[PDB]
């Protein structure tokens, strides 16, 4: 099933979004992509996620002239301990000269319709998360 | 031109449907042909039962007394041991002139066969050939002659002690001792011929009368095993008589016809001709003397022709080839990628050599002996257990599920017992039955295995309850959690919470 | 005693007719064939073994 999903991601144009757990670091081969979004952190793996990012994104023809041909986004929760984890982790990449721009406002979210538009939906998500106890 | 994967899937589905339909058709054909063959066998059994009934009716004492009264005094004074061909011929000639053929007489189905025969005796007329044969059989049994009624699915067989032979008698044409004439004037095409004695015993006498017995009839008859089982209850107690009949048949059929047709030579132990031999058969020795020529094809001795098994299957059959034996015959093999390499390279199609060793080259497989609590293993780490004798000395095979885990917990050697191979899925998957363990450590291990089972018997329901407990806990928390939010609750905020009240 | 599956067929009216036909007059042989051509797996299976009881039943008057 993993290989079938990988082949669908590589070949099927309808599916271009794959969710990968921690196994995406070295347990298998990462297909060439252009957008990598990191939501969850190990807790300060400054080298593991850097290696994962290096492995995920490869050179793409067509956008060689542009200085921004591969896109990486790190979703970090404000005022949380995830801020410290991200700051500690990105130190290795900053030592390599990689820049990191902080984006607090996303342009286009107001026009586009997204899930949890109403606050009661967010209350339902909170109920679901609280239902997931410390066991998960 | 559009979704080639979909087209391939459609073609594969059509192929699978066609294969399944062909399988259903061939299964239906197999069932129908089996039903037809069983129906033919049942019809043959019905004819045999009718012959039994006719023979039983012919054994009545009243009919014998009537026949003896009818028989003239010149025939009643001859002992059965003094009966020869001339006496039988004279008796047949008298019988023909005594009873005539008259089918115009009334034939009522209500009249029993014994009553019908008594009426025929009273009128001295025969409705048909069957009644004439029955009357002649009654006449023969009147003199207490050892006579058998012979039917082709009819005539009589008389046992003469002067030559100790069964002489055929046909009263229809006045024929005595001419099996060829009886074969010519017999019933519908001859496949089985059975002779029933007055005592009820049945003997196969098709060989004596059929000249095509050894070539066409032999391949067109019923199963030998089923027929032998059917005739086993009615085997004649005269074992010496049966042996004499078999010897006479063998003497008659020992290379008497000498056919020259190629097709008759194919698949025949009597002849053992040329290339028509099977793929797994060879000639041992290769210097077999030529027994004849058939259109340029040499005849060899069947005793010199043997079926040869492979060394692997020799081991499977608990036999070991002698060391250094040259493979007598080289054949092809059907196996995994090792065989499939012939498909890639055609030049290796005939290069694949499999040595089929003969029985003379294989002596016996001697199972090893377990030493120092160690189970012997093959080249692949297992033990071949196709036969019980193949089990190594000091080893016991145990059919205990999850026994290997217990053995490893106790650090006890555990070897799989290979018993067969499954050819499903296009590959010969091995089949194992139980584990081979040392006998000295057997019983204690069994107890531990039982203890392990007891562990499961102790450690199953508990864990189930544990799951339920967690569920209950979860359920409780759920309510509390919802209730908690009720205690709390029973885009402007998000878009502009922290980084807007100062930027804007 | 020799309990056979043919015991039910021993007193079965259709099988009684069959044994009566097989007894003396084989004229009605094909009709029984048609019966065995319809559906009789039990008769096919059980007729191969213990023919003594089968023959004795066929010879019952």
Swiss-Prot record, chain A:
Residue ranges of the Helicase C-terminal domain?
1-115
Location in or out of the cell: Nucleus
Please give the residue positions where the record annotates the modification Phosphoserine. 99
Modification comment: Dephosphorylation reactivates the 5'-excision step. Phosphorylation has no effect on transcription or the 3'-5' helicase activity.
Query: Membrane-crossing residues?
Result: none
Give the family, as the similarity comment puts it: Belongs to the helicase family. RAD25/XPB subfamily.
Please give the clinical condition linked to this protein: Xeroderma pigmentosum complementation group B: An autosomal recessive pigmentary skin disorder characterized by solar hypersensitivity of the skin, high predisposition for developing cancers on areas exposed to sunlight and, in some cases, neurological abnormalities. The skin develops marked freckling and other pigmentation abnormalities. Some XP-B patients present features of Cockayne syndrome, including cachectic dwarfism, pigmentary retinopathy, ataxia, decreased nerve conduction velocities.
Quaternary arrangement and interactors, per the entry?
Component of the 7-subunit TFIIH core complex composed of XPB/ERCC3, XPD/ERCC2, GTF2H1, GTF2H2, GTF2H3, GTF2H4 and GTF2H5, which is active in NER. The core complex associates with the 3-subunit CDK-activating kinase (CAK) module composed of CCNH/cyclin H, CDK7 and MNAT1 to form the 10-subunit holoenzyme (holo-TFIIH) active in transcription. Interacts with PUF60. Interacts with ATF7IP. Interacts with KAT2A; leading to KAT2A recruitment to promoters and acetylation of histones. (Microbial infection) Interacts with Epstein-Barr virus EBNA2.
**What is the protein's given name?**
General transcription and DNA repair factor IIH helicase/translocase subunit XPB
Native species: Homo sapiens (Human)
Q: Gene for this protein?
A: ERCC3
- Span of the entire protein shown here: 588 to 723 of 782
UniProtKB/Swiss-Prot annotation, chain C:
> According to the lineage, what is the superkingdom?
Eukaryota
| STI1 domain mapped to chain residues | 4-47
Q: Where in the cell is it found?
A: Nucleus; Cytoplasm
Q: What is known of its domains?
A: The ubiquitin-like domain mediates interaction with ATXN3.
What's the subunit arrangement here?
Answer: Component of the XPC complex composed of XPC, RAD23B and CETN2. Interacts with NGLY1 and PSMC1. Interacts with ATXN3. Interacts with PSMD4 and PSMC5. Interacts with AMFR. Interacts with VCP; the interaction is indirect and mediated by NGLY1.
The UniProt similarity line reads:
Belongs to the RAD23 family.
Q: What's this protein's function?
A: Multiubiquitin chain receptor involved in modulation of proteasomal degradation. Binds to polyubiquitin chains. Proposed to be capable to bind simultaneously to the 26S proteasome and to polyubiquitinated substrates and to deliver ubiquitinated proteins to the proteasome. May play a role in endoplasmic reticulum-associated degradation (ERAD) of misfolded glycoproteins by association with PNGase and delivering deglycosylated proteins to the proteasome.
Name the UniProt record assigns to this protein: UV excision repair protein RAD23 homolog B
Protein species of origin: Homo sapiens
């Amino acid at each position: 099933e993993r290989m079938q999903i990988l082949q669908n991601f590589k070949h099927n144009p309808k599916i271009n979004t794959i969710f990968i757990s921690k196994v995406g670091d070295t347990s298998f081969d990462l297909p060439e992509a252009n957008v990598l979004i990191q939501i969850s952190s190990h807790g300060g793996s400054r080298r593991q996620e850097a290696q994962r990012l290096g492995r995920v994104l490869r050179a793409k023809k067509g956008m060689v002239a542009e200085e921004y041909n591969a896109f990486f986004y790190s979703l970090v929760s404000q005022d949380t301990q995830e801020m410290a984890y991200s700051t500690k982790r990105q130190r290795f990449l900053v030592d390599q000269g990689y820049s990191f721009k902080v984006i607090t406002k996303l342009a286009g979210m107001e026009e586009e319709d997204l899930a949890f538009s109403t606050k009661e939906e967010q209350q339902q998500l909170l109920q679901k998360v609280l239902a997931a106890t410390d066991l998960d | 031109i559009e979704t080639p994967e979909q087209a391939k899937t459609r073609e594969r589905s059509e192929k699978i449907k066609l294969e399944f339909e062909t399988y259903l058709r061939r299964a239906m054909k197999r069932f129908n042909k089996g039903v037809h063959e069983d129906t033919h066998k049942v019809h043959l059994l019905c004819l045999l039962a009718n012959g039994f009934y006719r023979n039983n009716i012919c054994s009545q004492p009243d009919l014998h007394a009537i026949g003896l009264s009818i028989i003239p005094a010149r025939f009643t004074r001859v002992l059965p041991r003094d009966v020869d061909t001339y006496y039988l011929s004279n008796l047949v000639k008298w019988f023909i002139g005594t009873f005539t053929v008259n089918a115009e007489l009334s034939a009522s189905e209500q009249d029993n066969l014994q009553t019908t025969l008594e009426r025929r005796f009273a009128i001295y007329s025969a409705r048909d050939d069957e009644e004439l044969v029955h009357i002649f059989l009654l006449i023969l049994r009147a003199l207490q002659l050892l006579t058998r009624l012979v039917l082709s699915l009819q005539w009589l067989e008389v046992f003469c002690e002067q030559e100790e032979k069964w002489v055929c008698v046909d009263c229809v044409h006045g024929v005595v001792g001419q099996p060829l004439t009886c074969y010519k004037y017999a019933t519908k095409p001859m496949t089985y011929v059975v002779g029933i004695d007055s005592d009820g015993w049945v003997r196969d006498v098709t060989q004596r009368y059929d000249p095509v017995w050894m070539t066409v009839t032999r391949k067109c008859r019923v199963d030998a095993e089923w027929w032998a089982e059917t005739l086993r209850p009615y085997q004649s107690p005269f074992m010496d008589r049966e042996k004499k009949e078999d010897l006479e048949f063998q003497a008659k059929h020992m290379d008497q016809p000498l056919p020259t047709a190629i097709g008759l030579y194919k698949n025949h132990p009597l002849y053992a001709l040329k290339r028509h031999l099977l793929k797994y058969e060879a000639i041992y020795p290769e210097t077999a003397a030529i027994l004849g020529y058939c259109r340029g094809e040499a005849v060899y001795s069947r005793d010199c022709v043997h079926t040869l098994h492979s060394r692997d299957t020799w081991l499977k059959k608990a036999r070991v080839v002698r060391l250094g034996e040259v493979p007598y015959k080289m054949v092809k093999g059907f196996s995994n990628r090792a065989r499939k390499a012939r498909l890639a390279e055609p030049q290796l199609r005939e290069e694949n050599d499999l040595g089929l060793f003969g029985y003379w080259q294989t002596e016996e497989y001697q199972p090893p002996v377990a030493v120092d609590g160690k189970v012997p293993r093959n080249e692949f780490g297992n033990v071949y257990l196709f036969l019980p004798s193949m089990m190594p000395i000091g080893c016991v095979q145990l059919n205990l599920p999850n026994l290997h885990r217990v053995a490893r917990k106790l650090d006890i050697d555990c070897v799989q017992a290979i018993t067969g191979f499954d050819f499903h899925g296009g590959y010969s998957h091995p089949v194992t039955d139980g584990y081979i363990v040392c006998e000295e450590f057997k019983d204690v291990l069994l107890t531990a295995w039982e203890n392990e089972q007891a562990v499961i018997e102790r450690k199953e329901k508990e864990k189930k309850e544990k799951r339920a407990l967690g569920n209950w806990k979860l359920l409780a928390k759920g309510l509390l959690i919802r209730e908690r939010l009720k205690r709390r609750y029973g885009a402007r905020i998000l878009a502009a919470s922290w980084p807007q009240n100062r930027e804007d | 005693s020799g309990g056979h599956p043919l015991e039910f067929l021993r007193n079965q009216p259709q099988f009684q007719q069959m044994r009566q036909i097989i007894q003396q007059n084989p004229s009605l042989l094909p009709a029984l064939l048609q019966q065995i051509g319809r559906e009789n797996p039990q008769l096919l299976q059980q007729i191969s073994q213990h023919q003594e009881h089968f023959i004795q039943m066929l010879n019952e008057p």
